[PDB]
Design an enzyme around this catalytic site. Structure first.
Site, PDB file in Angstrom:
ATOM      1  N   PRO A  20     103.647  91.127 -15.624  1.00 56.02           N
ATOM      2  CG  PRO A  20     105.814  91.377 -16.496  1.00 56.02           C
ATOM      3  CD  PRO A  20     105.371  90.918 -15.283  1.00 56.02           C
ATOM      4  CB  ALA A  22     103.974  92.081 -24.264  1.00 53.54           C
ATOM      5  CB  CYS A  85     109.030  85.801 -22.573  1.00 46.94           C
ATOM      6  SG  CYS A  85     107.622  87.188 -22.384  1.00 46.94           S
ATOM      7  CG  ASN A 185     104.620  84.161 -12.755  1.00 45.77           C
ATOM      8  OD1 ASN A 185     105.481  83.753 -13.893  1.00 45.77           O
ATOM      9  ND2 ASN A 185     103.287  84.223 -12.825  1.00 45.77           N
ATOM     10  CG  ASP A 187      99.533  76.648 -12.908  1.00 47.65           C
ATOM     11  OD1 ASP A 187      99.676  77.849 -14.186  1.00 47.65           O
ATOM     12  OD2 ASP A 187      99.856  76.007 -13.554  1.00 47.65           O
ATOM     13  N   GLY A 209      99.148  86.577 -13.193  1.00 51.98           N
ATOM     14  CA  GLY A 209      98.982  86.696 -15.204  1.00 51.98           C
ATOM     15  C   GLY A 209      97.581  86.365 -15.325  1.00 51.98           C
ATOM     16  NE  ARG A 210      98.566  81.144 -17.416  1.00 55.69           N
ATOM     17  CZ  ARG A 210      98.936  79.708 -17.516  1.00 55.69           C
ATOM     18  NH1 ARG A 210      98.748  79.788 -18.607  1.00 55.69           N
ATOM     19  NH2 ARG A 210      99.409  79.638 -16.503  1.00 55.69           N
TER      20      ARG A 210
HETATM   21  C1  LIG Z   1      99.689  87.285 -23.951  1.00 52.54           C
HETATM   22  C2  LIG Z   1     100.887  86.609 -22.462  1.00 52.54           C
HETATM   23  C3  LIG Z   1     101.469  87.490 -22.707  1.00 52.54           C
HETATM   24  C4  LIG Z   1     103.103  87.351 -21.745  1.00 52.54           C
HETATM   25  N1  LIG Z   1     103.960  88.183 -22.104  1.00 52.54           N
HETATM   26  C5  LIG Z   1     104.768  88.530 -21.392  1.00 52.54           C
HETATM   27  C6  LIG Z   1     105.943  90.015 -21.340  1.00 52.54           C
HETATM   28  O1  LIG Z   1     105.652  90.632 -22.107  1.00 52.54           O
HETATM   29  N2  LIG Z   1     106.636  89.738 -20.125  1.00 52.54           N
HETATM   30  C7  LIG Z   1     106.887  88.700 -19.160  1.00 52.54           C
HETATM   31  O2  LIG Z   1     108.171  88.561 -18.330  1.00 52.54           O
HETATM   32  N3  LIG Z   1     106.199  87.776 -18.961  1.00 52.54           N
HETATM   33  C8  LIG Z   1     104.808  87.834 -20.147  1.00 52.54           C
HETATM   34  N4  LIG Z   1     103.474  86.840 -20.018  1.00 52.54           N
HETATM   35  C9  LIG Z   1     104.333  85.817 -18.979  1.00 52.54           C
HETATM   36  C10 LIG Z   1     103.442  85.515 -17.934  1.00 52.54           C
HETATM   37  O3  LIG Z   1     103.935  86.855 -17.250  1.00 52.54           O
HETATM   38  C11 LIG Z   1     103.417  84.241 -17.144  1.00 52.54           C
HETATM   39  O4  LIG Z   1     101.924  84.270 -17.476  1.00 52.54           O
HETATM   40  C12 LIG Z   1     103.235  84.765 -16.141  1.00 52.54           C
HETATM   41  O5  LIG Z   1     104.851  84.580 -15.578  1.00 52.54           O
HETATM   42  C13 LIG Z   1     103.027  82.173 -15.369  1.00 52.54           C
HETATM   43  O6  LIG Z   1     101.441  82.042 -15.289  1.00 52.54           O
HETATM   44  P1  LIG Z   1     100.258  83.080 -14.438  1.00 52.54           P
HETATM   45  O7  LIG Z   1      99.799  83.533 -15.851  1.00 52.54           O
HETATM   46  O8  LIG Z   1     100.158  81.499 -14.589  1.00 52.54           O
HETATM   47  O9  LIG Z   1     100.768  83.824 -13.611  1.00 52.54           O
HETATM   48  C14 LIG Z   1     102.937  86.271 -20.573  1.00 52.54           C
HETATM   49  C15 LIG Z   1     102.230  85.683 -20.902  1.00 52.54           C
HETATM   50  C16 LIG Z   1     101.322  85.431 -21.727  1.00 52.54           C
HETATM   51  C17 LIG Z   1     100.181  83.786 -21.524  1.00 52.54           C
END
Ligand SMILES: Cc1cc2nc3c(=O)[nH]c(=O)nc-3n(C[C@H](O)[C@H](O)[C@H](O)COP(=O)(O)O)c2cc1C
Length: 306
Positions: A20, A22, A85, A185, A187, A209-210
């Protein structure tokens, strides 16, 4: 997969979850992720792909339970709780991983949300609040006791933010202590890292995610490797064009051409940020203020490699 991945009564098609995010995860993006191989996509609280998973955030057990009820009445099949978060404020109060400092507020929110809905309730956390305060196993054991049916762990503490590297040691330790499915979760950026994390942690699923922002097709690329031990070849420039142009057109329906070109600019800049960051096309495309010109400029860039 030992009997696939399951969140309650729901068996997932694969062990790959779209994180997820936002602002990022809108209906058009989540649908593209699902079409591109994601077994599950997670959306924001107040007609979606696959199993409808909606994430709720907040600090009040009663307000949390109401959000869970309102979103299930609105079509949510699974309710997720944000306790991950690192700088999240909901109704001006500190929420997300801020809650991880206080197992009593955690216990109360989880209990109240679980007995509010007749739907599977899942929890998304972090290692702890700070490197000195990793309460990962405690929060996992408590979540299981409260009736949580799946747990996602990002391998960073609240203090870590998005710095350094994610660690999988905490994830590995939790999985060994808890009986509920654990989702790893942090990287997971390619199929090889994914396999390595799945192997080390023994996790039931992976959340990405990213890495899906500029490469939504990463879900099928990772699934293919996990399943076959064979890598999918890189998506050719012509197929990328088709996917990115079909997406920007979908972004012109949803929200109209007025607000759409502004979003298509965001989603195209993520693809550009990953495949050509120091490019001439990046600066010129961001300058465009017309929806039809965006689609024209998009096929113009992809034809130079043809
Ligand atoms: C722009 C942005 C918004 C995010 N919004 C949320 C959110 O609304 N809820 C949540 O649980 N995690 C949120 N995350 C956390 C992501 O799930 C996070 O990127 C992931 O948990 C770990 O990084 P990964 O992108 O390497 O998987 C957000 C991350 C980013 C970069």
């Amino acid at each position: 997969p030992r009997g696939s991945m399951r969140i309650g009564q729901y068996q997932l098609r694969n062990r790959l979850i779209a994180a997820p995010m936002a602002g990022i995860t809108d209906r058009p993006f989540r649908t593209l992720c699902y079409e591109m191989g994601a077994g599950l996509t997670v959306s924001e609280m107040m007609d979606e792909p696959g199993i409808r998973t909606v994430q709720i955030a907040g600090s009040d057990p009663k307000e949390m339970a109401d959000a869970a009820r309102i979103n299930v009445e609105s079509g949510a099949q699974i309710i997720d709780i944000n306790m991950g978060c690192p700088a999240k404020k909901v109704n001006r109060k500190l929420a997300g991983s801020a809650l991880l400092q206080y197992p009593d507020v955690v216990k109360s929110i989880l209990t109240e949300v679980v007995n509010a809905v007749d739907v599977p309730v899942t929890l998304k956390i972090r290692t702890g609040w700070a490197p000195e305060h990793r309460n990962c196993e405690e929060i996992a054991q408590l979540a299981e006791d409260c009736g949580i049916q799946a747990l996602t762990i990002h391998g960073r503490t609240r203090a870590c933010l998005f710095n350094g590297e994610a660690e999988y040691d905490s994830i590995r330790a939790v999985k060994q202590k808890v009986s509920i499915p654990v989702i790893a979760n942090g990287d997971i950026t390619d199929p090889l890292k994914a396999r390595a994390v799945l192997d080390y942690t023994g996790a039931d699923a992976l959340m990405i995610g990213r890495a899906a922002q500029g490469r939504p097709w990463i879900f099928r690329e990772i699934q293919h490797y996990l399943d076959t031990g064979e890598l999918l070849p890189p998506l050719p420039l012509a197929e990328v064009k088709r996917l990115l142009c079909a997406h920007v057109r979908e972004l012109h329906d949803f929200y109209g051409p007025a607000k759409g070109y502004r979003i298509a600019r965001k989603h195209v800049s993520w693809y550009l940020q990953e495949h050509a960051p120091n490019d001439q096309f990046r600066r010129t495309f961001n300058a465009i203020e017309d929806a039809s010109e965006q689609l024209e400029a998009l096929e113009a860039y992809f034809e130079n490699f043809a």
